[PDB]
Design a protein around this ligand. Structure first.
Ligand SMILES: *C(=O)[C@@H](C(C)C)[C@@H](O)C(=O)N[C@H](C(=O)N[C@H](C(=O)O)[C@@H](C)CC)C(C)C
Ligand SMILES: *C(=O)[C@@H](C(C)C)[C@@H](O)C(=O)N[C@H](C(=O)N[C@H](C(=O)O)[C@@H](C)CC)C(C)C
Ligand SMILES: [Cl-]
Ligand SMILES: [Mg+2]
Ligand SMILES: [Mg+2]
Ligand SMILES: [Mg+2]
Ligand SMILES: [Mg+2]
Lengths: 243, 250, 204, 244, 241, 231, 226, 125, 196
């Protein structure tokens, strides 16, 4: 034994225990989801209200990369911010050289290679976040989820954090019951519901809902936050479904 | 990131042993048998092509390598370590000799350069020693024919004939009884094939044996005429057919 | 201003039957001012002889450099360097200063100890090799030496005849150059004896 | 991080010794014996090759006696590959000094340099020390004939006669017994061989197991010759002195 | 026992971190196969999509390195993508510096040499992947060269990688014992893909739908992967004889 | 236990012990309170002395005319992070003729603290900060933890016995948020809040440290007889 | 300097003159302007003679190492890319103008490379002070589908044009023939059209003609034994 | 470069590497210094375990730093050479910039400064 | 050097002369000034042969590596990589480059990069010393959405005039046609285009 004390050490199994320990920090975090719709993507996240002293709508968690990509993460929040900062450098250098805004698959591999690099050496610690991200490019909508190991795939729906099993089940129903696809406005409503349903795992403290979207029709293929009347409409729909 | 292993991974133990060099020599012992014999008019180096799978094409894996037109190398131990040493050995023959003196290094000096690379893996920060022993055979105008062994420590010794790896102890005894100072090259090849048969379990033919000589100049292998002082390489790898012909007179 | 003609001086080398000859004047100047009549321009590293004309600081530096390099060569190779190999070392050494060169005109002369073959070579300041059969010339009176050598020289001269030819080539070329003269030295080189003769010449 | 795997090669023991130096000296004690003897008219270097084979090419072999310049030679005890790194450094220092001052390097200046390089590997860098001890035999026009030794610590000392490697305790007692100040080179040759003959772990001392060298003013008039003895010349001196 | 944590020799002369990296190789539970035709090289790999939420079009272990070279990986995807990006970079730099397309066997040697360094230098860990490189080389013709975490590489007539490699290996060994030739004697690549899929079915004892396989094909001057519908046409031809 | 030797090592339950140990240094530090209305933002700090001969350790640092923080934990680390905020505030003014937004100041402190939690050799910061400011979107109060977590609040407290002040502010939330255009009453509410965290000792003239920033009020610190008014 | 390259049916031929000049003075009457990069890849070099030899030996060395690494015979396009990228880096300060030719697995090739790093393709090329004299002969007599015998004739005729009409060129013609599936033949002094006539007089001196101050034996031998 | 902190504090407020360096000095041959009214004398021990020594060439225990200052030592001989060299260089540097030889106090302060620096620098003992 | 790129209905056509000069001496009379950076992205080179060859080689490398990672690059992306090299190394380069390419989405596109390193997207572009003499002709005769035969005639007639008046231009007129159908090379000899 001792194989789990140092990063980049293969156990006799062929496992990197330090990466597996990072996943535990992710599992410990709040619930965050992603839904791929007809012409775009929707992101949502659970924000635990620790105290009445927290200013509502102010501690924003979802982050924009370039103008077309949304990122949301569960686990160590600072680690997520560090990864998005790197993401913004990658997207800036791509646009500087190639002119076109970075495609989503291209962007995914930039984060992927960077996170994978933090499993190659004992001088660094793996990332304590799973990141759900995506947006709209020239080839249409793309949703991705990226784990501490550097592993990422494309998703129809994605979920991570404490309420992930609950969320995954609700996402699996939508995929089966809508093979022709889901509209952007529908996906915002369904996103609100799934966070409310996933809140049963964090039922001790009350929470604040936060949604964002990129849609070719609804936002012109730019990342925007859901605000005001459209946010309240999605909260009302979510509150109706739990009762 | 940064390489934060700036300290030695090979140190002296209380008994005065260098552990990582001893363990490297153990890895060499587990490796397949290779040998070298020096004749009056040439040198022969030989080894078994231990094929990992029959689907593998063993012609694509070269255990006997040209370093310069007049110097060849064979090994026992870890093949990958040997491959990168052959790359570094070829480059250092140019950078630290041919680019300065306009001629290929003599056998003893190239050996010295390979030894120096292997010594540095024994003392430099954050590296393990090379897990190979090399046998280097060569010719040069002022020293004639020569055969050298190089160990993981960086130590090198000249030999009349020797063997390294799996069945070295038995092979060296066989060579001591057969070797004299009046051997022709054909006689040394005959002895090399006899010696190598003892250490081989399975098939013994031109497809499972790798054998090269340092002999006469080969003008047919030079690739151009018109310069009288360039008469071609002394290193020649024997063909599958050329080995099988000498196995009938065995 | 021109570094190759501040200090002045000349070297010439020739081949004969089983022998080579190399010769130089002894002058060092500061342009018009004569400074030294004892500045020899021929050096040797074992049986290989090197003449160097041009800027005197560089002549001295390059001699010190090739002594250093041939000393280490002998310790590692366990034998004296040969003329053919030394020629390649001079070429390499000069070309590594391609964009900041030594202002010199080197000349190699010697007999290969194994083959017995007479060998001479010349170089430009960045190390290009001229390996002539007949003769090599270098320095501020190189034009004058080309004229003397091209008429006086014949192949396969005996050592004592070759001495007269190279001596007369140097002396008469030196006397038509303002920056060469003030004495002269001739080396006659055979496979296992070398004779060094100082020549009597006009001191103006 | 990396700290976990660091041996810390440059630290003191609670007793104030350098672990790696002490363990390197233990390594050297198992190496073939090398002897240096200084006489009025020259110096002798003798050394024993370690358990050889009948198939080792002896005439082209050199593991023990190396030439540094035309006036200085060394006898090696320890890792040959480590010695060669240092030898090539010493050869360069000698030529650097000759280029700068246009005089051959005095023996003590060359010895101090090599010794200072060894010292550095004990105080900084976190690398293992060189597993080598040298006997320096040399001549210069200030102190004449000189013998020195250096060890992995980087400490060096001067000697009239000295041994390094295996069985130095036994060898130093035999030299201390038969050495005299008015001794000559021919006498010192005989003492060096007699000392190895008695201290060797081999059954008998033969030509194929020895390397031998002399630094004489036995060179026509006022100069110094280094002689690295050939296999046939070692065989002759073994018959002359009456050991075979 | 720190000789099991970093790439230094054990008393037996072994590198445990290299051996454990080989074990990571099989973590994906996927089997790959590579064979050579007359004019082509075919590589097939199992495709498993366990999650219904995954986009199946983005799940792949076959990579287009250059126009001529394809690479299939046996091992975790992060290390696979690490190796892929490096091979792509190396193949592009080669063309720029030396003015011709990097040969399959030379890329394999370079990637193997990189792997060798991770076994000798302590700060770098080995990649838990086995890289199978395929092309139709302009000098050597149809080519299969495979790399592992030890830094070993060799050429192959055909090869197999994964948990059930030995079963596939013996199946192929037996076929080449009968035919007594180094390749599949077939004109079209379509029939060489049909051979590859047939002999994988026989060896593993499982049937395959269009979504259960992933196919790559090397021809003269291009390497390409088949779509689900291109595989379905292959599976129909196998069933109809 | 085995996983607390350095910041580069996760525990089997996914914890970073070196960070949690740095978080402990804050709890040992002296209490400090932060609270704001719509017009003004206030810091109140209980300063700690070594003995009766010694001075009271300063707790409040000015970063710009419109921004500053109070500290609890290692004072030298607060000097490093406050110096970094002074520079980022200064860079914003010089390059963009723009006062640095309080929210963006939080984001920069978070990212600086994070780098020290993912790299070998270094150590986490051993201090917690309460940043107040008035920018283009009105009054703001932030809480910085050396984990990297920065949070925007109406009010809060950090240090020893901070929970008492934090409960009081949670009750008074609806009252003190409405104290607009009355600096004295907002400070009274801050002094009454920090009083809930005292035991044995009371607020004396060289004990108490108050700072305020607002609509037409530069960031100013009150010490000595300037805080006697509020005792 | 007069260098030419001529393509033929099954290969490429390269030719050059043998004169080296320092201003108006002929330094070398038998200069070698043909360089072997690899056994079947040769080039003719014009400009700074030290630069042509240095640049062909550096790339020739790297080509040999590359050939060993890839287990493949070297390609002309490789030598070309490596030469042009080196010369471009040094912005023309390395004064090497080369005609690069050879045979490899791809076929027979002929390129020109200028000191600044530009490359040209062609069936016939010429470089140096004699290029205009040589190119006049090539433009007059070159045709598609030349035989080997015709191409050596055309190449050596183009060099002769340079020898006679150009003051920067003289002495002899060097040729190198690179045919597909054959060893490259390097014909040093293929033509010798400029042998100096017998002199009118012998200038051999009587012995003792030169005045001598001092004689001494030089000690070339090492320090002696005994 | 090698950065490892070899000289560190222990729970009882001791620096063991510095204390173990004093143990090396204890092992060294005895050295003594006595100042009179108009002179100073430096006495040094030579251990008689080493005979067959050449006393002409063997490093002497007292070293001149300048024409007017001397340095003797006890401890590791190889270590002493590095302090003597640095001191001799600083002596000539002082003469070159101040146009006056070092005071004995100044030369001492310099050597002691070098010794101190090697107790809180990374990678050095 | 006379070079042009013209966009028509089915794609884009690149045209160039074949003359390289050292002073008044024609070093090469069969030069190919049309160079491939991708299957359907080509460029016209004007200025230093060494500089334009070096730039094209680096761009071909960048787009090969782009293709391996992100699939086929846009003509706009190719022009951007050319611009980056030309703009960031403006002090040490003499290169005027016309970038021409065919997408299926965007169809035929032409980008010109003059000395400064600026980029200009145009329906057609002319450059090199020869271009000065045909600004009048090209402006009067260019129409959008021409046929292949009309566009080959337009380029042939334009470069014919440029060659006639410019000593720096001459030899053959080379053309490269970029359409959905693929890549066609054309050559037109003096006896053909001189009598126009
Ligand atoms: C030939 O190029 C040179 C040989 C390699 C020694 C030498 O003959 C020479 O310098 N020739 C000069 C020459 O041809 N120069 C051409 C030229 O200037 O056209 C090169 C410099 C190419 C630019 C003659 C003497 C001008
Ligand atoms: C053509 O551009 C060159 C070929 C690519 C070799 C060559 O013929 C040449 O030197 N052309 C010059 C030229 O066109 N230069 C242009 C220009 O004049 O516009 C540069 C300024 C770059 C635009 C002729 C000889 C002037
Ligand atoms: Cl490599
Ligand atoms: Mg005169
Ligand atoms: Mg005069
Ligand atoms: Mg490793
Ligand atoms: Mg014209």
């Amino acid at each position: 034994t001792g194989y789990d004390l140092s990063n980049s050490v293969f156990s006799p199994d062929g496992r990197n225990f330090q990466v597996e320990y990072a996943v535990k920090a992710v599992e410990n975090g709040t619930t965050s989801i992603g839904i791929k719709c007809n012409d775009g993507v929707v992101f949502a996240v659970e924000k635990l209200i620790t105290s009445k002293l927290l200013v509502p709508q102010k501690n924003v968690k979802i982050q924009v990369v370039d103008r077309h990509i949304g990122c949301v993460y569960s686990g160590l929040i600072p680690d997520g911010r560090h990864l998005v900062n790197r993401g913004r450098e990658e997207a800036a250098s791509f646009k500087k050289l190639y002119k076109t805004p970075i495609p989503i698959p291209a962007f995914a591999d930039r984060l992927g290679q960077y996170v994978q690099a933090h499993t190659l050496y004992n001088s660094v610690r793996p990332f304590g976040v799973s990141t759900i991200f995506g947006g709209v490019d020239k080839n249409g909508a793309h949703l991705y989820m990226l784990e501490p190991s550097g592993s990422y795939w494309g998703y129809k729906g994605a979920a991570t954090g404490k309420g992930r099993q609950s969320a995954k089940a609700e996402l699996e129903k939508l995929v089966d019951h809508h093979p022709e696809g889901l509209s952007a406005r529908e996906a915002v409503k369904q996103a609100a519901k799934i966070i409310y349903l996933a809140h049963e795992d964090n039922k001790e403290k009350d929470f604040e809902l936060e949604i964002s979207w990129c849609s070719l029709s609804e936002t012109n293929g730019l990342h925007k936050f859901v605000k005001g009347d459209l946010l309240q409409e999605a909260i009302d729909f979510a509150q109706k479904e739990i009762n | 990131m940064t390489d934060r292993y700036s300290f030695s991974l090979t140190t002296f133990s209380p008994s005065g042993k260098l552990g990582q060099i001893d363990y490297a020599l153990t890895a060499v012992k587990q490796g397949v048998t290779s040998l070298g014999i020096k004749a009056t008019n040439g040198v022969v180096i030989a080894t078994e092509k231990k094929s990992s799978s029959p689907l593998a094409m063993s012609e694509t894996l070269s255990k006997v390598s040209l370093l310069t037109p007049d110097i060849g190398a064979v090994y026992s131990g870890m093949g990958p370590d040997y491959r990168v040493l052959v790359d570094k050995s070829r480059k250092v023959a140019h950078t630290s000799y041919k680019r300065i003196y306009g001629e290929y290094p003599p056998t003893k000096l190239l050996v010295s350069e390979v030894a120096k690379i292997m010594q540095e893996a024994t003392q430099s920060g954050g590296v393990r020693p090379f897990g190979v022993s090399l046998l280097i055979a060569g010719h040069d105008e002022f020293n004639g024919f020569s055969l050298y062994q190089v160990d993981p420590s960086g130590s090198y010794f000249p030999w009349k004939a020797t063997a390294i790896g799996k069945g070295s102890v038995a092979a060296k005894t066989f060579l001591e009884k057969r070797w004299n100072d009046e051997l022709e090259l054909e006689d040394a090849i005959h002895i090399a094939l006899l010696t190598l048969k003892e250490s081989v379990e399975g098939e013994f033919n031109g497809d499972t044996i790798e054998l090269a000589i340092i002999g006469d100049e080969n003008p047919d292998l030079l690739g151009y005429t018109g310069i009288p002082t360039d008469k071609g390489p002394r290193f020649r790898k024997l063909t599958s057919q050329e080995i099988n012909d000498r196995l009938e007179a065995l | 201003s021109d570094p190759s003609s501040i200090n002045g001086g000349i070297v010439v080398a020739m081949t004969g039957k089983d022998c080579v000859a190399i010769a130089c004047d002894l002058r060092l100047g500061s342009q018009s001012l004569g400074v030294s009549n004892k500045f020899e321009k021929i050096f040797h590293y074992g049986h290989v002889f090197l003449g160097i004309t041009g800027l005197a600081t560089d002549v001295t530096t390059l001699n010190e450099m090739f002594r250093y390099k041939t000393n280490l060569y002998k310790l590692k190779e366990e034998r004296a360097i040969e003329p053919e190999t030394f020629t390649q070392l001079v070429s390499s050494s000069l070309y590594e200063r391609r964009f900041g060169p030594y202002f010199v005109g080197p000349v190699v002369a010697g007999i290969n100890s194994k083959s017995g073959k007479p060998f001479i070579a010349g170089f430009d300041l960045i190390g290009c090799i001229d390996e002539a059969k007949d003769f090599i010339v270098s320095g501020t009176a190189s034009d004058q030496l080309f004229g003397m050598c091209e008429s006086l020289y014949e192949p396969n001269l005996e050592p004592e005849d070759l001495f007269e030819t190279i001596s007369q080539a140097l002396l008469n070329a030196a006397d038509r150059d303002a920056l060469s003269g003030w004495g002269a030295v001739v080396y006659i080189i055979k496979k296992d004896e070398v004779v060094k003769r100082y020549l009597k010449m006009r001191q103006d | 991080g990396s700290r976990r795997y660091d041996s810390r090669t440059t630290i003191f023991s609670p007793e104030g010794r350098l672990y790696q130096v002490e363990y390197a000296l233990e390594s050297i004690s198992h190496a073939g014996t090398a002897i240096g003897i200084m006489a009025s008219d020259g110096i002798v270097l003798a050394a024993e090759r370690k358990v050889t084979s009948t198939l080792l090419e002896q005439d082209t072999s050199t593991e023990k006696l190396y030439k540094l310049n035309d006036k200085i030679a060394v006898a090696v005890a320890g890792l040959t590959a480590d010695a060669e790194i240092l030898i090539n450094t010493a050869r360069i220092h000698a030529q650097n000094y000759l280029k700068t001052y246009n005089e051959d390097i005095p023996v003590e200046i060359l010895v101090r340099r090599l010794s200072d390089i060894k010292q550095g590997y004990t105080q900084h860098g976190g690398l293992r020390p060189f597993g080598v001890s040298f006997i320096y035999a040399g001549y210069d026009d200030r102190y004449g004939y000189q013998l020195y030794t250096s060890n992995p610590s980087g400490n060096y000392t001067g000697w009239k006669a000295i041994s390094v490697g295996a069985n130095t305790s036994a060898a130093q007692t035999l030299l201390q017994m038969d050495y005299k100040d008015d001794m000559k080179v021919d006498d010192a040759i005989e003492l060096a061989l007699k000392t190895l003959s008695k201290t060797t772990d081999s059954s008998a001392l033969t030509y194929d197991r020895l390397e031998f060298a002399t630094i004489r003013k036995g060179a026509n008039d006022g100069e110094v010759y280094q002689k690295i003895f050939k296999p046939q010349e070692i065989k002759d001196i073994l018959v002359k002195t009456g050991i075979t | 026992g720190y000789d099991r944590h970093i790439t230094i020799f054990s008393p037996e002369g072994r590198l445990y971190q290299v051996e454990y990296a080989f074990k990571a190789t099989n973590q994906t539970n996927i089997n790959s196969l590579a064979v050579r035709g007359k004019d082509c090289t075919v590589v097939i790999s199992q495709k498993k999509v366990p999650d219904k939420l995954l986009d199946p079009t983005t799940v792949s272990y076959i990579f287009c390195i250059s126009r001529t070279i394809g690479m299939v990986v046996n091992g975790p995807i992060p290390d696979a993508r690490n190796a892929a990006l490096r091979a792509k970079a190396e193949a592009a730099e080669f063309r720029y510096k030396y003015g011709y397309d990097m040969p399959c066997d030379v890329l394999a040697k370079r990637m193997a040499n990189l792997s060798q360094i991770y076994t000798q230098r302590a700060y770098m860990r080995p990649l838990g992947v086995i890289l199978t490189f395929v092309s139709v080389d302009e000098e050597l013709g149809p080519s299969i060269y495979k790399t592992d975490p030890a830094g070993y590489y060799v050429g192959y007539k055909a090869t197999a990688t994964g948990p059930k490699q030995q079963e596939i290996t013996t199946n192929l060994e037996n076929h080449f014992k009968k035919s007594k030739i180094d390749h599949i004697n077939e004109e079209s690549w379509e029939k060489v893909v049909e051979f590859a899929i047939t002999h994988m079915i026989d060896a593993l004892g499982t049937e395959f739908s269009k979504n259960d396989l992933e196919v790559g094909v090397a021809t003269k001057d291009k390497f390409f992967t088949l779509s689900a519908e291109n595989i379905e046409e292959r599976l129909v031809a196998i069933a109809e004889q | 236990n085995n996983y607390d030797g350095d910041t580069v090592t996760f525990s089997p339950t996914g914890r970073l012990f070196q960070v949690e140990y740095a978080l402990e240094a804050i709890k040992q530090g002296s209490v400090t309170v932060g609270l704001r209305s719509n017009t003004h933002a206030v810091l109140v700090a209980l300063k700690r002395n070594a003995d009766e001969l010694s001075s009271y350790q300063k707790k409040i640092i000015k970063c710009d005319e419109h921004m500053g923080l109070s500290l609890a934990g290692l004072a030298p680390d607060a000097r490093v992070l406050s110096n970094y905020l002074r520079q980022q505030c200064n860079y914003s003014s010089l390059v963009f003729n723009r006062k640095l937004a309080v929210e963006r100041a939080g984001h920069l402190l978070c990212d600086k603290a994070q780098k020290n939690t993912q790299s070998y050799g270094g150590r986490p910061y051993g201090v917690g900060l309460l940043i107040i400011g008035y920018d283009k979107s009105g009054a703001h109060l932030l809480e910085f933890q050396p984990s990297g977590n920065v949070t925007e609040l109406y009010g809060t407290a950090i240090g020893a016995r901070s929970q008492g002040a934090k409960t009081y502010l949670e009750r008074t939330l609806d009252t003190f948020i409405k104290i607009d255009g009355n600096p004295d009453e907002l400070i009274k509410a801050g002094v009454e809040a920090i009083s809930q965290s005292l035991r044995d000792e009371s607020l004396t003239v060289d004990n108490l440290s108050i700072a305020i920033v607002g609509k037409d009020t530069p960031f100013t610190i009150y010490d000595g007889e300037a805080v006697a008014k509020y005792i | 300097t007069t260098i030419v390259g001529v393509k033929f049916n099954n290969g490429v031929v390269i030719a050059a003159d043998t004169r080296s000049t320092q201003g108006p003075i002929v330094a070398d009457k038998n200069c070698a302007k043909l360089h072997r990069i690899s056994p079947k890849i040769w080039c003719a070099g014009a400009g700074t003679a030290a630069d042509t030899e240095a640049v062909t030996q550096l790339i020739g060395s790297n080509i040999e190492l590359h050939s060993l690494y890839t287990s493949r015979e070297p390609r002309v396009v490789s030598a070309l890319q490596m030469l042009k990228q080196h010369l471009f880096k040094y912005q023309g300060h390395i004064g090497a103008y080369l005609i690069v030719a050879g045979v490899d697995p791809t076929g027979s090739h002929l390129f020109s490379i200028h000191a600044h790093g530009s490359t040209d393709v062609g069936y016939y090329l010429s470089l140096g002070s004699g290029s205009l004299a040589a190119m006049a002969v090539l433009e007059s007599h070159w045709k598609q589908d030349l035989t080997k015998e015709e191409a050596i004739k055309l190449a050596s005729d183009a060099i002769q044009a340079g020898i006679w009409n150009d003051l920067g060129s003289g002495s002899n013609v060097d040729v190198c023939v690179m045919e597909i599936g054959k060893d490259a033949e390097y014909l040093r002094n293929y033509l010798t059209p400029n042998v100096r006539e017998e002199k009118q007089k012998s200038y051999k001196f009587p012995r003792g003609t030169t005045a001598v101050l001092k004689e001494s034996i030089v000690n070339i031998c090492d320090i002696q034994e005994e | 470069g090698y950065d490892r902190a070899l000289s560190i504090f222990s729970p009882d407020g001791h620096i063991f590497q510095v204390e173990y360096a004093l143990e090396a000095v204890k092992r060294g041959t005895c050295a003594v210094g006595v100042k009179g009214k108009n002179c100073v004398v430096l006495g040094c021990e030579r251990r008689s375990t080493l005979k067959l020594q050449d006393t002409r060439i063997t490093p002497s225990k007292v070293s001149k730093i300048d024409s007017h200052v001397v340095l003797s030592f006890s401890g590791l001989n190889a270590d002493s050479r590095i302090l003597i060299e640095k001191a001799r260089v600083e002596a000539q540097s002082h003469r070159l910039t101040l146009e006056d030889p070092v005071t004995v106090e100044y030369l001492t302060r310099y050597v002691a400064g070098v010794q101190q620096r090697y107790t809180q620098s990374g990678g050095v003992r | 050097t006379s070079i042009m790129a013209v966009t028509f209905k089915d794609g884009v056509i690149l045209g160039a002369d074949s003359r390289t000069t050292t002073g008044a001496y024609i070093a090469n009379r069969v030069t190919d000034k049309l160079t491939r950076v991708h299957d359907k992205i080509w460029c016209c080179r004007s200025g230093s042969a060494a500089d334009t060859q070096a730039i094209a080689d680096i761009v071909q490398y960048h787009l090969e590596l782009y293709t391996s990672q992100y699939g086929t690059p846009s003509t706009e992306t190719a022009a951007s990589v050319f611009k980056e090299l030309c703009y960031e190394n403006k002090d040490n380069l003499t290169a005027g480059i016309i970038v021409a390419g065919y997408d299926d989405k965007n169809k035929g596109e032409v980008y010109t990069i003059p000395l400064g390193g600026s980029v200009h997207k145009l329906p057609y572009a002319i450059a090199g010393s020869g271009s000065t003499f045909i600004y009048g002709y090209c402006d009067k005769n260019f129409r959008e959405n021409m046929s292949k035969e009309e566009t080959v005639d337009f380029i042939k007639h334009s470069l014919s005039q440029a060659i006639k008046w410019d000593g720096s231009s001459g030899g053959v007129i080379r053309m490269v046609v970029l359409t959905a159908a693929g890549v066609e090379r054309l050559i037109f000899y003096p006896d053909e285009y001189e009598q126009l």
